[PDB]
């Protein structure tokens, strides 16, 4: 009776009347005497006592008492829909779910009503009012459904218009206060939970073909009470994590939002972070972080923005879960392997022309090149709300506070070094994904970095040397000591040292100070389809450019050496010892520049 | 990357690193540094401590690949062990493309082995084999060992105690250059054979309630994998048929069955393909499975040592686990009483209300 009451209001919006003219039957066609002939199908009408119409294969049945709808008047305006919801729906109660079609109709009415006045100034009024309505009448109903994804898809298609704070309010209230203290909701939640655990006990590498579909249906229909057992089971078991990340490919946006919700729930639940024994971190942080990284890697419609706001926020207080999630995100999605163990030949190839570098990286088991698209997506998540500079400064100034703690040295050294490597790897990712003008736009330019925050000079140059070399080489208009002008260079004590030597040391690199020319030939000879695109477009063009660069740099160093114990002391003090203690390439480069630059 | 302290080839280092090896055992660090120089080695160690890896890394170090030249010959006792040694050579030679490995054992046409030996695409520098088949190849000049530099004999005790095996290995040894590297490896070298956290519980009940009880336990306990110990093959196969009928994926392994299917199902369950496995005491010793977290002793054994061997399949390398046993007769309680006196362990009676799941994970 309610659906008949509401139908004419529903057709007036979400206009289907213009599309009503497509419910017709195929004409019976027959070939007689060698010509086509069309006829209509013939049916007859019977009257029965059953209320719902039907059509049993030749004839149509109808309810006999054809004026039962005489005493009722359909709605004329959504306001009447509210006024009569308060009577019929407050009676039907949580059982509205027994008829899915009503959910769809009311939700589409809501969507069209919100879309009708996108321009007007009073939109927030209608948004608040529909928020209250969906909170009180529809969401408890949709919590009752049984393996029926599309209805929840519709309700969420309406919910998409709210601030996410409100969606979290509704979800959490439904979880805490309305699951208990209401009977049919409690029954449905308990049934769904028991069924979810029953399925979770039977996930295998061999039975995934059907268990994945069943789990997808069950999670998509009634997520926020069937997800928590799954979240715990992957919180402390090994392979269920990979299995779940495999089966996320199937559920709709509602499951996605609820999944992100319960992830924040578990990440914020009150419990200890460090292991009971000592300073070792607990055994769930790692598996949860692996899960989150797998999510960011595989399913690309996940929208983990709020988790990244969690990171950017809770790093301020030094939460270990933030650092861990960041490490696993960088290493799994981005593909940025560290430089702890590198043979001298690989270390050499790792800074050369493009193809030699690519071969070196693929040899060191690094896959940053093949992951360009998803790395760009993640850095786009980071780009919004301008988290880049805040995160770099946070990581840096956090490692210092880690240096000033008190513990056993055997853990202090390892912690400090681990933070250092994490920062280095993050900056490698940032330089890989943000190029051109976007870099200079969202990476906090040099002089502020070095004068306001007092970063140590090696990190400053480690960020800016590539961009400075690029702006110097092509656009020969500007010159060094101008594009880096104004820097205070605080710990340097530029007295009693030629700033020419300073900037000539830190500006350069290894690629522009050493030409082997043997590795190029080795690669060219071992590479001899179209012959691999003609030896990768005659890789040797990069070697030619490399020769030109070597020649220009050596020409520079000639006049510079024509130009230049106190200096011999301060040079070691502030120029080669700080440079060597960095990653290996800085050490090799300090070695090479010690020679070929002096008498 | 402890093997990086070994100062070996980088591609070999990557092939070891992708094999999960991170810290060498005692026997590896004690033997590989000296075997790399080409000295003969005679090794005795406890089984399963990575004795194959020693000489595998050694021969992958000392080899300089020469086309069509066989320098490395390994002789074993079985065909499946030969397959395992060639698989080890393959997982060790991932980053070595020029080197080629081959395996020789009975049951295959000798002409196919010959033609693959003549093929340049399959001309092997490393050959693992059974002594009889490789003897039949050398004596027919199907393979040339005039340039062999490395001779490995695994399980050398059985190689030298059996007369046919020692004669075959000596015929292979006399056809090799005398100035070669020689290595023998075995877990058992008697004196007679060139300058060489676990939780323990029990259920005392009657037989006719077992089938429903597990159907409850296997329903409530949170588990990765479950193993079911039985005393007979018929009861085990029946319980597996019923469990698979119970929407519970389960496998069965025991005697009275062809070895092929035993290896097949053993390997299958090792790979996390199903979550329930049932076996008699055939796997009472030697088995190594990590993910088993919950064990159900359907029928107790006769002696305490067999029960401890059973429970050893859980809590591998000092990890956490849960064990629960069935008691249905007098000798069951007898062995239950004897295990505590020998092993100093209180096997309490399993409470009805269940145990905290975190007490075993």
């Amino acid at each position: 009776v309610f659906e008949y009451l509401l139908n004419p209001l529903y057709t007036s919006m979400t206009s289907s009347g213009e599309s009503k003219d497509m419910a017709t039957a195929l004409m019976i066609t027959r070939i007689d005497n060698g010509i086509l002939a069309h006829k209509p199908r013939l049916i007859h009408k019977y009257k029965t006592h059953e209320p719902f119409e039907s059509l049993e294969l030749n004839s149509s049945y109808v309810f006999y008492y054809s004026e039962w709808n005489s005493n009722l008047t359909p709605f004329a305006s959504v306001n009447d829909l509210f006024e009569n919801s308060h009577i019929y729906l407050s009676i039907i109660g949580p059982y509205l779910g027994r008829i899915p079609t009503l959910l769809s109709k009311i939700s589409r009415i809501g969507v069209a009503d919100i879309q009708k006045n996108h321009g007007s100034e009073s939109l927030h009024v209608t948004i608040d009012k529909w928020i209250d309505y969906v909170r009180k009448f529809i969401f408890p109903a949709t919590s009752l459904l049984q393996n029926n994804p599309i209805a929840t898809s519709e309700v969420y298609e309406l919910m998409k218009f709210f601030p996410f704070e409100k969606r979290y309010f509704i979800y959490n209230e439904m979880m805490t206060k309305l699951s208990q203290d209401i009977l049919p909701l409690k029954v449905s939640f308990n049934k769904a939970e028991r069924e979810a655990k029953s399925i979770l006990k039977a996930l295998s590498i061999d039975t995934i073909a059907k268990e994945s579909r069943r789990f997808a249906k069950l999670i998509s229909t009634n997520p926020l009470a069937s997800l928590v057992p799954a979240v715990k089971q992957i919180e402390n078991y090994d392979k269920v994590s990979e299995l779940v990340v495999y089966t996320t490919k199937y559920f709709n946006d509602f499951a996605y939002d609820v999944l992100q919700f319960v992830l924040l729930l578990r990440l914020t639940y009150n419990r200890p972070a460090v292991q009971f024994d000592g300073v070792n971190q607990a055994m769930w942080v790692q598996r949860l972080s692996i899960f989150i990284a797998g999510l960011a890697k595989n399913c690309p419609n996940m929208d983990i923005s709020n988790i990244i706001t969690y990171i950017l926020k809770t790093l301020h207080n030094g939460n270990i879960i933030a650092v861990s999630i960041l490490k696993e995100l960088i290493i799994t999605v981005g593909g940025i392997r560290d430089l702890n163990e590198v043979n001298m030949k690989q270390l050499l190839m790792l800074n050369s022309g493009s193809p030699l570098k690519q071969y070196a990286r693929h040899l060191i088991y690094d896959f940053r090149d093949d992951n360009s698209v998803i790395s760009s997506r993640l850095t786009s998540f980071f780009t919004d709300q301008s988290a880049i500079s805040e995160i770099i400064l946070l990581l840096y100034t956090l490692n210092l506070k880690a240096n000033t703690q008190n513990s056993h040295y055997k853990i202090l050294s390892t912690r400090c070094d681990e933070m250092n490597t994490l920062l280095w790897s993050f900056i490698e990712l940032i330089k890989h994904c943000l190029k051109g003008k976007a870099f200079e736009e969202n990476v906090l330019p040099f002089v502020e970095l070095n004068n306001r925050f007092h970063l140590s000079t090696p990190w400053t140059f480690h960020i800016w040397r590539d961009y400075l070399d690029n702006q110097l080489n092509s656009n020969e208009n500007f010159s060094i000591d101008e594009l880096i002008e104004g820097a205070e260079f605080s710990d340097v004590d530029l007295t009693k040292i030629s700033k020419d030597l300073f900037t000539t040391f830190w500006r350069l690199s290894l690629y522009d100070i050493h030409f082997d020319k043997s590795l190029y030939d080795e690669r060219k000879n071992a590479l001899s389809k179209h012959l691999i695109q003609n030896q990768i477009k005659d890789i040797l063009v990069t070697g030619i450019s490399h020769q030109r660069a070597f020649k220009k740099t050596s020409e520079f160093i000639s006049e510079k050496s024509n130009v230049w114990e106190d200096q011999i002391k301060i040079f070691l003090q502030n120029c080669v010892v700080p440079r060597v203690l960095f990653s290996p390439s800085d050490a090799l480069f300090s070695s090479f520049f010690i020679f070929m630059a002096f008498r | 990357t402890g093997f990086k302290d070994f100062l070996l080839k980088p591609e070999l280092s990557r092939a070891i690193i992708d094999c999960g090896f991170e810290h060498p055992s005692e026997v590896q660090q004690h033997t590989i540094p000296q075997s790399i120089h080409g000295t003969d080695v005679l090794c005795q160690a406890k089984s399963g401590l990575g004795k194959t890896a020693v000489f595998v890394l050694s021969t992958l170090q000392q080899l300089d690949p020469v086309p069509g030249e066989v320098a490395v010959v390994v002789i074993c006792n079985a065909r499946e062990l030969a397959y395992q040694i060639r698989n080890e050579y393959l997982r060790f030679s991932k980053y070595m493309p020029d080197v080629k490995t081959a395996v020789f054992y009975g049951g295959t046409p000798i002409s196919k082995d010959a033609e693959l030996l003549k093929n340049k695409d399959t001309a092997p520098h490393i050959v693992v084999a059974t002594p009889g088949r490789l003897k039949a190849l050398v004596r027919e000049k199907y393979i040339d060992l005039s340039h062999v530099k490395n001779f490995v004999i695994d399980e050398c005790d059985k190689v030298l105690e059996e007369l046919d095996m020692r004669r075959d290995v000596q015929e292979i040894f006399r056809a090799t250059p005398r100035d070669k590297q020689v290595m023998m490896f075995s877990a058992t070298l008697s004196q007679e054979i060139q300058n060489p956290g676990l939780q323990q519980y029990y259920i005392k009940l009657e037989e006719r309630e077992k089938n429903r009880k597990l159907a409850q336990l296997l329903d409530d306990l949170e588990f990765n994998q479950v193993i079911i110990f039985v005393k007979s093959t018929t009861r085990a196969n029946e319980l597996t048929k019923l469990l698979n009928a119970s929407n519970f994926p389960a496998i069965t392994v025991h005697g009275h069955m062809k070895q092929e299917e035993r290896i097949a199902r053993y390997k299958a369950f090792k790979d996390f393909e199903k979550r329930i496995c049932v076996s008699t005491d055939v796997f009472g010793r030697g088995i190594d499975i990590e993910r088993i977290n919950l064990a159900i002793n359907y029928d107790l054994t006769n002696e305490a040592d067999q029960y401890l061997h059973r429970v050893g399949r859980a809590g591998r390398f000092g990890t956490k686990g849960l064990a629960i046993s069935f008691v249905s007769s007098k000798e069951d309680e007898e062995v239950l009483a004897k295990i505590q006196e020998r092993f100093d362990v209180k096997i309490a009676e399993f409470p009805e209300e269940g145990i905290d799941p975190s007490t075993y994970l």
Partner: peptide, 24 residues
């Protein structure tokens, strides 16, 4: 009906799949 429903909800009932459908 209320009591039976609440009990069958909170406690739940084990659906016998192969329970007691054999012996030995």
């Amino acid at each position: 009906l209320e009591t039976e429903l609440e009990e069958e909800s909170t406690k739940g009932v084990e659906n016998p799949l192969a329970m007691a459908a054999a012996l030995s």
